[PDB]
């Protein structure tokens, strides 16, 4: 119940401290940084939530999955453009990612995006790759991209008691394609060593990516072809009611696994 090395999860972000103790034993491949917001800038923390090893300072959700660390920057100090993100997504698709985790995003009018990014996200849809992205922390009837784009799984933040956090964005498109996941005081690794608990849709997002990876890993165990876009559908269909701030509902892992096996909740 800890993942499968045949299931590939990509982290698209800023720098990731792969020397952190929690990644000792993790199956992590770092794609090279190429020649010349969307970066959460919590790359180490985000990655640890999925791939942190059992018995280390950060136990991850899917420590047996194959991780791909994909830089979406050339220089970490420069604004990440939509083309920077698009190229990162394409690199992740080309590397065989099943799931692509984007803990960053930008606030928009109503989820519009320019051509490069729209096309990169459509490529995921066309190739059955699941993009999971942070809803944003503006606390309004608001949409981020890539979270609000077609076939993306948007992720909002709820507290320990299952209530939406006030900062988590709740624009209407999220009602069809967003779910709430734990996003208050989520444990993760600090670059340079140590750990910390942080709050935000950036941390809720990798929880969902990790759960999606576990669902795909169970498909493998069942002798079924991994199906990232069906997994998105199952996470949405199994989400529990809390009203607009609930999005499609609250992440429901047991319900998702029940639906995965064709059961009923």
TrEMBL record:
Which cysteines are cross-linked by disulfides? 140-142, 242-246
The residues responsible for catalysis, as annotated, are 13 (charge relay system), 42 (charge relay system), 202 (charge relay system)
Q: Which residues form the Peptidase S8/S53 domain?
A: 5-242
- Hey, which family's this protein in? Belongs to the peptidase S8 family.
- Give the shown range, full length included: 11 to 288 of 702
Name of the gene this protein is made from: patA
What protein name applies here? Answer: Subtilisin-like protein
